[PDB]
Design a binder for this molecule. Sequence first.
Ligand SMILES: Nc1ncnc2c1ncn2[C@@H]1O[C@H](COP(=O)(O)OP(=O)(O)O)[C@@H](O)[C@H]1O
Ligand SMILES: [Mg+2]
Ligand SMILES: [Mg+2]
Length: 332
Amino acid sequence: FIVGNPWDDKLIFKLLSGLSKPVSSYPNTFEWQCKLPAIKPKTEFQLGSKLVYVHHLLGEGAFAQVYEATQQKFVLKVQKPANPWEFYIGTQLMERLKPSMQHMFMKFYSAHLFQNGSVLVGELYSYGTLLNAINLYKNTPEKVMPQGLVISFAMRMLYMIEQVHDCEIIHGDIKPDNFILGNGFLESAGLALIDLGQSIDMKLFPKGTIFTAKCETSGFQCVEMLSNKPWNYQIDYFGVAATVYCMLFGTYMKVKNEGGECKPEGLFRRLPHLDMWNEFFHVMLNIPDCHHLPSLDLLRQKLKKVFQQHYTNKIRALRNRLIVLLLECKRS
Ligand SMILES: Nc1ncnc2c1ncn2[C@@H]1O[C@H](COP(=O)(O)OP(=O)(O)O)[C@@H](O)[C@H]1O
Ligand SMILES: [Mg+2]
Ligand SMILES: [Mg+2]
């Protein structure tokens, strides 16, 4: 079966409207028949029965604001209009995941839906985005993240979407600012994938459904989109590839085609493990069809071999270097 836009507003309204267990029926869902209250740094406000103290704004995305808060810290994802969809996705993901996996993602504890917006209450990750981390390295002598950390993060990402895809979900927006580092990093274990607002639940579609939308909700395109070919899970493969590209070169990935072979731009000078990375980008960017998705496990093993061959000893020195950079930015 074929579907135009998996992010279409009327489509999501209908998918939610016809759920056996609609978001409105969750025990941790709360509906309110009033406007979204004003939310501001270092200020209290009423969120249902509870009074909530907001600290400072943690970050801003394409659609929403995420603040730190307490009544154990947690976050408030605030969005206009309301986004019950992200809450639905988050709920399903945590249901379908093996409990040992859930630490790689962000739990939503509750959702407060209003007439014109929503507040999603979720888990906190305290040490900024991967995009930010990449920026922190730009302002150092070394300029780029070390290979040990890059290969490490890359493997975790491959592992992450492997778990997500196993739940038959598509993240749909895998990029540097949707990866967060938490305090679990102080003790790749602390890396978390967040922002499920553009995610797709394939279980809500017939077996073998594919999509033809030639672009994302903010202009970005994956490989199949650039060729007007169909796609489902490939969009996440592209996202991971683009993310690792950004860790490697500090800029956003652009692709070219040469003889039916898709590959990222750049002359790849100053790039170590050139053979490993070319094989990585080859497999990630040249997916024949929706039926022949490359083994995420296999990709990660190839990175693991190189990692084990060069960086087992040194990862401790590398993560320390980063934590120092992270703490400096947080206290700032
Ligand atoms: N769990 C979290 N802990 C700390 N900051 C977060 C968390 N989740 C998101 N953020 C910050 O909020 C920003 C926007 O949130 P996100 O979920 O990406 O919404 P959007 O869909 O608008 O991108 C992110 O870029 C990130 O910096
Ligand atoms: Mg985001
Ligand atoms: Mg989003």
